[PDB]
Write a protein that binds this ligand. Structure first.
Ligand SMILES: Nc1ncnc2c1ncn2[C@@H]1O[C@H](COP(=O)(O)OP(=O)(O)OP(=O)(O)O)[C@@H](O)[C@H]1O
Ligand SMILES: [Mg+2]
Lengths: 469, 36, 90, 513, 109
C-alpha cells in the first residue's frame, strides 16, 4: 500500500505513489472502502502521479487514502466455474451463489493473436438454422451483426444458438452485457434456468454471463466487454473448443469509451466520439478470431444512432462485421418466428470460392425468387391476381412455399409451441432448397412447408394430406 | 432548390382564384337580396 | 447546409410523394371502372403510371436529401464542439 | 506552466515566514476564491467526496472536487453571503434527507426542509441521498400494473410497477398533465383501503417557477389526492446544486417505501433541466466538456438514478418504485444528447406530438413511436386480449391515413377501415383531470374493438362513453365488480356486454349512421 | 514476367495494409502463396490492434522499400489499403497532441 489518493474528480482519480509506479492498465485497489473499489491506470501525469478511472462510485473517498498496486491488469477468474455464474467486470460474483471456482485468473488486457497463429481459409460455422446457413452463413471466428428490435426473435434466437452450438459442437457460449438494463438482466437470467440453458447443478450450464449495469460508472461498461472476451479466450486456447461471444449492443461499449476519454480530458473527435474509436473497437474485435486451437465467433447487437449508417461508431464497426442478421417485424406478424430477413441479411463469406458453387447458386436463386415475389406483391395490391400471367402465379406459389419453408422450430420454444425443434444440417438444407427450385414441391400445399425441418418431412406430410382425401 | 416555396405559391394562387370567384358570387347574391 | 432548410425541403418532398402515391391508388380504381365500362381509361392509366414514377423519383430524392441532412448534422455537432474546446483550452 | 490555485500569496507567505501554524487544517478550511456559486477552499483535508460543509455565515456546500491543493465546493445557496477568507468546517456526514410516512402531504425542499409552512416535520430517521441501486437478484419480474388512468397508456403503453417509462415530448404537449392524472387515479385505494394497490406518489419539480407548483398543490388538495403524495421542489431560483440533488432526494424517499414492501411512484418533472444544472456546476469547475457542453458522465448521472426504480422480490418485501421521468424535446428531435441517453436507459417512452395536440387529440400520444418493453405482462388479464387487436387496427389505420383525404374515390372495405380508426382515436381522447378506472376502460375499449362504434357518428363517441358508463355503473355493478376483483373478462361477461351495448346505442338519444 | 524472365516488364509488388483485420491479411497471403505470386510480393501489415503511429507510418515504410527498386532501375507497384485508416490514425495522434482540428476534426496538414 505505497500509494495515496492525491485528487478525486468524479470517476477520475489521481494516485500519488512512492518508488516504483504501476505499469499502465494495471489494477489498483483502494483500502478501507465498504466495497471493493478498483482503479484502472490510464496515464502517468508525472511527479510520481498516475491518473486512473474508477470501476465503482468514488463517493466517500479521502485524499491521502492508501492504495495498493496489484501489479497486473484486472485479472478475472476463467474456466468452467464461471459457467452458470453471473460475473462482474472485476470478476466478482453477483448471483449470491458464493465464491467462484477458478482454474486461473487471466488479465483483461492482452495482445491479440499473432500473424502466425492466425487461421486462414475461413470456414462456415454450422449454426443449424436453414436461412442463416444458406443465405447469411456465419464465418467461424468472425464478427456478426444482429439488427433486431426489442423482443422480435432476439432472445429465443440467442438461446437456440447456444444450445445448438453446445450439442452439434463441443463449445460453450459467453454473454457479455455491456451496459444492460438491470431489469432485462434478471429476465434473461430467469429466462435461463427455465429453458435449462444454465442450471445450479455442476457439469451443466454451457454459458457464462458477464454484466455491466448502466448504473455502473464509465470504465466498468467499457471493460466489461473485454472481461467476457477473456473468459472466452480461455476456452479457445486451453480447452481448444469453439466459443460463442454474445455482446449486448456494441454501441454502448463504444459510448462508454467515449465517456472515459472525455473525462480524461482528451479532445473529442468528429461527432463527439473519442479519438481512439477505431483502436478501442479494434482491440476487442481483433482478439476475436479463429486460431489453430479453436475459434471465437461473436454475435453482437448493432444500434444505429439516428438511423445514420454513416455514423462513426456503426461505420467503424461494419468495417469488422463479416455477416449481418436482420430481424424483421413483418415476419413475426405472418407467423414465421425466425424474424431474419433473407434479402437484408448478408454475409461477406458468401461467394463461390469460400463455399461450393452449388451453395452460392442456390442462395442467389432463392434471393432472386424472393425478390421477384416482392415486386409482384406491390403490383397485385393495385391490379389483382388475374392480371398476372401463369408464370407469375407459379412464382408466387413457389416463393410463398420457400418463405414459409425458411421457418423452422427451435428446441428452446418447443414447450411453448408444442412442436419439437429441428437441427437442420447444411448438406440437407442445400439439397432441399435446390430440389424446391426445380419444382419438386409445387404440387403440394403451401401450409405443408411450415415449421418443417427438412424437405423429406414436408414431402411426407404432403403425401399424408393426399391420403386424407 | 426550394420545393416548399413552390407548393406555397401554388396553394396561394389557386385559393385566390377560386375564392375571388366566390366573392363575386356572394356580392351579387347579397345585393339581389338587399334590394328586396 | 442549414439543416432547418433541409428538413423543410425533406418535409415538402414527403408530402409530394404521399399525395402522388394516393393519386396512383385513385387512378387504379378509376381505370378499373373504365375498363369495366369499356380513351378515358387511357388517361387514367397514364396518370397511374406517371404518379408511380413521380413517387419513385421523389423517394430517391428524399433518400439522397436524408444523407445530406445526416452529413450536415454530424458537421454541426463537430463544429459546435470545436468552439467549446477552443474556448476551454485557454 | 501557468499557475496553481493552491499557490495563493497568503498561503505562500506563511511558508516563507516559517511559522507552521495551520489552525487545525484537518476538518477546517479557508476560502481562497468565490465565483458563480463555486468556492475553492485550501486545506479542509479529511473531507469526503460529496460531503456537506458549513460556511461561516451558515450556508452549506458540497465538496465535489478534491484536488491536490484545494477543494472545489458548490455552495447550496446565494453566493453573495460568504467572501474570501471565510472558514469552512466539514459537517462530517454525507448529505441525507428525512424519510417516513409523516411526510406525505407536505411540500419539501431538496434537502428535506418543509417550505409549505404547515409546521415542523416529525420523522423517525434519515436516509443517504446517494447509494447503489438493487442488484439483479433482489429484483423480480414486473408483473403488477400501475394504472395511470389514461386509456391510451393503460391499453397500448402499459406501465408495470418497477418500470421506467419516459414521458418525452415538446413543450406544452401535456406531459405534466399525464403525471397529475396518474396521481389522481391512485386515490381510490387510499379512500377504499386496498393496501395491495396503494401507490404513494412523489412529484419532483426541477427548474419550475413556484407559481405553477402552488397551482399544482391546490389541484391536489382540491381533488383530495394530497395526503399520500410528496412534492419536492427545486425551483428556478434555487441554486444549480439543488436542482441536481432534488431527483436523488425524491428517489431516496421512494426507496423507503420500496424497502418496506410498500409501492411508490416517483415523477421527475423537467429532468432535462437537471442535466443543465449539472452542466453548469461542471463547467464552472472547469471539467472537460463534451457534446453540447455536457460533461462526460451526464449519462451516468441519470443511470444511477433511474436504475434505483425496481421491483424487489418477495423476500425483501415485494415493494416497488415506479419512475416517470419527463423530457422536453426542442424540435421533436430525439437524436439530441440527453434524449438518446434517457431513452437508452428507460424501458419505454411515451412520445407526445404537438401537431396531434393541435388536431384536438388529447392526450397527444403518438402510439407509433410510443413503446413499452414490459408490454402485456403489466396489463390485467382482461385488457391484454382486446389491446392486441386495438394496436393492430391503429397500425393499419396509420398506414392508411395517407389516403384519408381521398375517401370516396377509394374503394370500399378501405374507407371503412378509415372510418373505424377515427372512432377509436376519438374514443382514446380524454379530458384533463379525468382519470378512468381500469374496469371502465375495458368496457369502452371493448365497445370499440368489437366495432359497435362504427354505427355512431364520431362526434358522439365521447357522449356515449360518459353516458354508457353511467348506465353500466348504475345498473351493471356486479359486472364491473367481477372485472375489478377477478381481473379478467370472463366469457359470460363478454356476452353480457356484447348484448347490452348495441341495445344501449339504439335507445340512446345520440344519432347513428 | 518473373517466370519467363522478361526483366523489362516484371515489376515487384508491395501491399501495405492500414487498419485491416489480421485474419484478412493472413487469408490474402495464403491466396498469394497458392498462385506462387508471393516470391516477388511484399506485405507491410499494420492491423487495427496496432497502435496509431504504426498505422500512420506503415505507408511511408512501404514507399521506401519501393524507392529502392525505383532508384535501382527496377519497377515497383505499391498499394495502400485504405489511406482513410491512416488519416484516422493521424487524426488520433494529433487530437491527442492537443492540436486544433479542422473540418471533420482532421488536422490541417
Ligand atoms: N387531456 C387534455 N385535454 C385537454 N387539454 C389538455 C389536456 N392535457 C393538457 N391539456 C392542456 O395542454 C397544456 C399543457 O399542460 P401541461 O403543463 O400538463 O403539459 P407540459 O408539456 O408539461 O407543459 P410545460 O412545457 O410548461 O411543462 C395545458 O394548457 C393543458 O391545459
Ligand atoms: Mg409541465
Amino acid at each position: 500500500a505505497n500509494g495515496q489518493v492525491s485528487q478525486v474528480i468524479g470517476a477520475v482519480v489521481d494516485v500519488q505513489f512512492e518508488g516504483e509506479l504501476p505499469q499502465i492498465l494495471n489494477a489498483l485497489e483502494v483500502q478501507g472502502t465498504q466495497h471493493r473499489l478498483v482503479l484502472e491506470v490510464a496515464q502517468h501525469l508525472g511527479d510520481s502521479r498516475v491518473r486512473t478511472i474508477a470501476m465503482d462510485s468514488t463517493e466517500g473517498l479521502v485524499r491521502g487514502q492508501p492504495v495498493v498496486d496489484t501489479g497486473l491488469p484486472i485479472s478475472v477468474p476463467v474456466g468452467p466455474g464461471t459457467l452458470g455464474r453471473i460475473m462482474n467486470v472485476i470478476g466478482e460474483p453477483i448471483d449470491q451463489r458464493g465464491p467462484i471456482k477458478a482454474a486461473k485468473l487471466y488479465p483483461i488486457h492482452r495482445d491479440a493473436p499473432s500473424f502466425t497463429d492466425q487461421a486462414t481459409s475461413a470456414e462456415i460455422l454450422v449454426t443449424g438454422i436453414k436461412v442463416v446457413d444458406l443465405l447469411a452463413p456465419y464465418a467461424r471466428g468472425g464478427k456478426i451483426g444482429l439488427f433486431g428490435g426489442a423482443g422480435v426473435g432476439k432472445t429465443v434466437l440467442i438461446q437456440e444458438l447456444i444450445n445448438n452450438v453446445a450439442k452439434h459442437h463441443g463449445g460453450y457460449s459467453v454473454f457479455a452485457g455491456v451496459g444492460e438494463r438491470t431489469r432485462e438482466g434478471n429476465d434473461l437470467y430467469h429466462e435461463m434456468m427455465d429453458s435449462k440453458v444454465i442450471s445450479v447443478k455442476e457439469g451443466e450450464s454451457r454459458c457464462a454471463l458477464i454484466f455491466g449495469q448502466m448504473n455502473e460508472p464509465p470504465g466498468a461498461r467499457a471493460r466489461v466487454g473485454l472481461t467476457g472476451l477473456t473468459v472466452a479466450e480461455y476456452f479457445r486456447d486451453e480447452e481448444g473448443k469453439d466459443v460463442l461471444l454474445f455482446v449486448d449492443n456494441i454501441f454502448r461499449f463504444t459510448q462508454a469509451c467515449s465517456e472515459v476519454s472525455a473525462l480524461l480530458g482528451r479532445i473529442p473527435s468528429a461527432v463527439g466520439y473519442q479519438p481512439t474509436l477505431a483502436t478501442d473497437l479494434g482491440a476487442l474485435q481483433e482478439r476475436i478470431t479463429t486460431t489453430q486451437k479453436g475459434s471465437i465467433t461473436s454475435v453482437q447487437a448493432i444500434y444505429v444512432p439516428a438511423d445514420d449508417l454513416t455514423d462513426p461508431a456503426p461505420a467503424t464497426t461494419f468495417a469488422h462485421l463479416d455477416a449481418t442478421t436482420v430481424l424483421n417485424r413483418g415476419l413475426t406478424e405472418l407467423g414465421i418466428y425466425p424474424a431474419v430477413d433473407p434479402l437484408d441479411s448478408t454475409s461477406r463469406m458468401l461467394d463461390p470460392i469460400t463455399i461450393g458453387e452449388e451453395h452460392y447458386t442456390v442462395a442467389r436463386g432463392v434471393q432472386k425468387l424472393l425478390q421477384d415475389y416482392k415486386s409482384l406483391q406491390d403490383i397485385i395490391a393495385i391490379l389483382g391476381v388475374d392480371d398476372l400471367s401463369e408464370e407469375d402465379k407459379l412464382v408466387v406459389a413457389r416463393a410463398r412455399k420457400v418463405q414459409k419453408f425458411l421457418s423452422q422450430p427451435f428446441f428452446m420454444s418447443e414447450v411453448f409451441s408444442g412442436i419439437p425443434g429441428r437441427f437442420v444440417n447444411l448438406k440437407q438444407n442445400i439439397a432441399s432448397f435446390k430440389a424446391l427450385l426445380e419444382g419438386a414441391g409445387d404440387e403440394y400445399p403451401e401450409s405443408c412447408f411450415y415449421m418443417k425441418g427438412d424437405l423429406e418431412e414436408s414431402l411426407a406430410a404432403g403425401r399424408a394430406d393426399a391420403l386424407k382425401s | 432548390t426550394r420545393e416548399e416555396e413552390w407548393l406555397d405559391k401554388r396553394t396561394k394562387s389557386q385559393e385566390k382564384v377560386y375564392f375571388d370567384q366566390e366573392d363575386r358570387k356572394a356580392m351579387k347574391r347579397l345585393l339581389e337580396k338587399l334590394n328586396t | 447546409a442549414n439543416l432547418k432548410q433541409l428538413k423543410i425541403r425533406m418535409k415538402a418532398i414527403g408530402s409530394i410523394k404521399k399525395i402522388t402515391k394516393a393519386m396512383k391508388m385513385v387512378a387504379a380504381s378509376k381505370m378499373k371502372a373504365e375498363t369495366s365500362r369499356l380513351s378515358s381509361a387511357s388517361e387514367q392509366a397514364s396518370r397511374m403510371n406517371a404518379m408511380e414514377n413521380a413517387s419513385k423519383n421523389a423517394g430517391e430524392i428524399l433518400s439522397k436529401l436524408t444523407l445530406d441532412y445526416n452529413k450536415a448534422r454530424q458537421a454541426k455537432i463537430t463544429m459546435e464542439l470545436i468552439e467549446i474546446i477552443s474556448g476551454a483550452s485557454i | 506552466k501557468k499557475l496553481s490555485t493552491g499557490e495563493a500569496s497568503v498561503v505562500l507567505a506563511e511558508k516563507i515566514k516559517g511559522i507552521t501554524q495551520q489552525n487545525d487544517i484537518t476538518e477546517y478550511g479557508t476560502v481562497i476564491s468565490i465565483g458563480d456559486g463555486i468556492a475553492r477552499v485550501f486545506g479542509l483535508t479529511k473531507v469526503q467526496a460529496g460531503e456537506m460543509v458549513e460556511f461561516k455565515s451558515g450556508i452549506r456546500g458540497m465538496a465535489l472536487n478534491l484536488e491536490t491543493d484545494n477543494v472545489g465546493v458548490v455552495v447550496l445557496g446565494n453566493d453573495r453571503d460568504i467572501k474570501e477568507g471565510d472558514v469552512v468546517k466539514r459537517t462530517g456526514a454525507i448529505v441525507d434527507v428525512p424519510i417516513g410516512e409523516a411526510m406525505c402531504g407536505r411540500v419539501f425542499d431538496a434537502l428535506g426542509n418543509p417550505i409549505d409552512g404547515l409546521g415542523p416535520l416529525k420523522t423517525t430517521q434519515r436516509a443517504r441521498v446517494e447509494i447503489k441501486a438493487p442488484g439483479i437478484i433482489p429484483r423480480q419480474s414486473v408483473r403488477q400494473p400501475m394504472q395511470t388512468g389514461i386509456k391510451c397508456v393503460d391499453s397500448l403503453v402499459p406501465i408495470g410497477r418497477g418500470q421506467r417509462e419516459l414521458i418525452i415530448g415538446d413543450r406544452q404537449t401535456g406531459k405534466t398533465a399525464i403525471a397529475i392524472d396518474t396521481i389522481l387515479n391512485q386515490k381510490e385505494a387510499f379512500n377504499t383501503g386496498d393496501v395491495k394497490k396503494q401507490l404513494y406518489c412523489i412529484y419532483v419539480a426541477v427548474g419550475q417557477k413556484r407559481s405553477t407548483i402552488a397551482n399544482l398543490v391546490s389541484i391536489l388538495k382540491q381533488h383530495d389526492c394530497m395526503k399520500f403524495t410528496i412534492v419536492v421542489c427545486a425551483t428556478a431560483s434555487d441554486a444549480a446544486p439543488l436542482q441536481f440533488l432534488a431527483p436523488y432526494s425524491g428517489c431516496a424517499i421512494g426507496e423507503f417505501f420500496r424497502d418496506n414492501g410498500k409501492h411508490a411512484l416517483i415523477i421527475y418533472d423537467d429532468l432535462s433541466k437537471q442535466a443543465v444544472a449539472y452542466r453548469q456546476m461542471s463547467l464552472l469547475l472547469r471539467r472537460p466538456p463534451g457534446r453540447e457542453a455536457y460533461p462526460g458522465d451526464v449519462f451516468y448521472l441519470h443511470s444511477r438514478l433511474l436504475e434505483r426504480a425496481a421491483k424487489m422480490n418477495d423476500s425483501l418485501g415485494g415493494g416497488s418504485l415506479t419512475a416517470l421521468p419527463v423530457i422536453e424535446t426542442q424540435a421533436g428531435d430525439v437524436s439530441a444528447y440527453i434524449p438518446t441517453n434517457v431513452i437508452s436507459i428507460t424501458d419505454g417512452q411515451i412520445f407526445l406530438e404537438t401537431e396531434l395536440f393541435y388536431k384536438g387529440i388529447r392526450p397527444a400520444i403518438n402510439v407509433g413511436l410510443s413503446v413499452s418493453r414490459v408490454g402485456s405482462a403489466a396489463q390485467i388479464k382482461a385488457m391484454k386480449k382486446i389491446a392486441g387487436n386495438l394496436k393492430l387496427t391503429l397500425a393499419t389505420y396509420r398506414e392508411l391515413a395517407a389516403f384519408s383525404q381521398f375517401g370516396s374515390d377509394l374503394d370500399a372495405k378501405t374507407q371503412q377501415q378509415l372510418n373505424t380508426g377515427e372512432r377509436l382515436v376519438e374514443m382514446l381522447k380524454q379530458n384533463q383531470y379525468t382519470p378512468m378506472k381500469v374496469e371502465e376502460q375495458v368496457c369502452i375499449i371493448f365497445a370499440g374493438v368489437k366495432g359497435f362504434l362504427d354505427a355512431l357518428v364520431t362526434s358522439e363517441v365521447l357522449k356515449f362513453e360518459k353516458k354508457f358508463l353511467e348506465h353500466v355503473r348504475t345498473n351493471h355493478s356486479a359486472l364491473l365488480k367481477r372485472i375489478r376483483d377477478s381481473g379478467d373478462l370472463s366469457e359470460v361477461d363478454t356476452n353480457e356486454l356484447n348484448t347490452i351495448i348495441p341495445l344501449f346505442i339504439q335507445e340512446g338519444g345520440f344519432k347513428l349512421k
